[PDB]
Amino acid sequence: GPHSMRYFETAVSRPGLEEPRYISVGYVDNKEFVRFDSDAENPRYEPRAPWMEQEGPEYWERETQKAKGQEQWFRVSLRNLLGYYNQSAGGSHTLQQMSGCDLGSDWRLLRGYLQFAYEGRDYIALNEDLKTWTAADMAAQITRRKWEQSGAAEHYKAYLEGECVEWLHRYLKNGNRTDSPKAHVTHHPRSEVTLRCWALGFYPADITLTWQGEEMELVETRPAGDGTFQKWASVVVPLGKEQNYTCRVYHEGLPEPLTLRWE
């Protein structure tokens, strides 16, 4: 199966505040594994999965220092962006970053990722070639030329082809699953009766529910709060004829798609 690492970093400046509040969240295979928050009393990277408590105090000390570097970089960058967009003092602003690497089932690098958003909106992003930058905004051209002139891409590319893959291999070895959905249909009388197909206790979150021999209200997939997810799909059905309708759950942990009904 394929694998991935990501770091999602956020910096928020507010009027009343003085220095930005900076948060960095690390993920392996889309699950949170470390976290740093500058609002903490003694700010540092803390483990967020039990399998990371294997890492010794030199690992945490270095990571914490990298984060303090990021803190400096997001604060300065925020200051510069304030100038680029002619925004004055007195507002709240956000700078965000996503980086990391996707590996194939063979553990080789599939793709590097490096993207930045300002005010929730794409600012600049490293293209898949890890050589050129995409930057839509006129204001964002200043940053693109700055980064083309300094050679920044080569250095982010070295990180993404090297450290990201290297250290992802190490995390995969150290943290050596999926939970299949359990389905059931519920009956609710109305005007006609409502049949709502539930899938519960599944991980990861990717799922699809349908009703049928042809292909409706649903909810977006949601966390149960325990690590598992929920979803339901429901349909309007005339009374007495409810054995004719069939739900189908599709999930990557299922040997084959579920097919069930009201009973």
């Binding site: 960095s24 690390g26 990571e63 970089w73 700078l95 982010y156």
Partner: peptide
């Protein structure tokens, strides 16, 4: 292994 950014925006 957290990244470390290069040139500022």
């Amino acid at each position: 292994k957290a990244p470390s950014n290069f040139a500022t925006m």
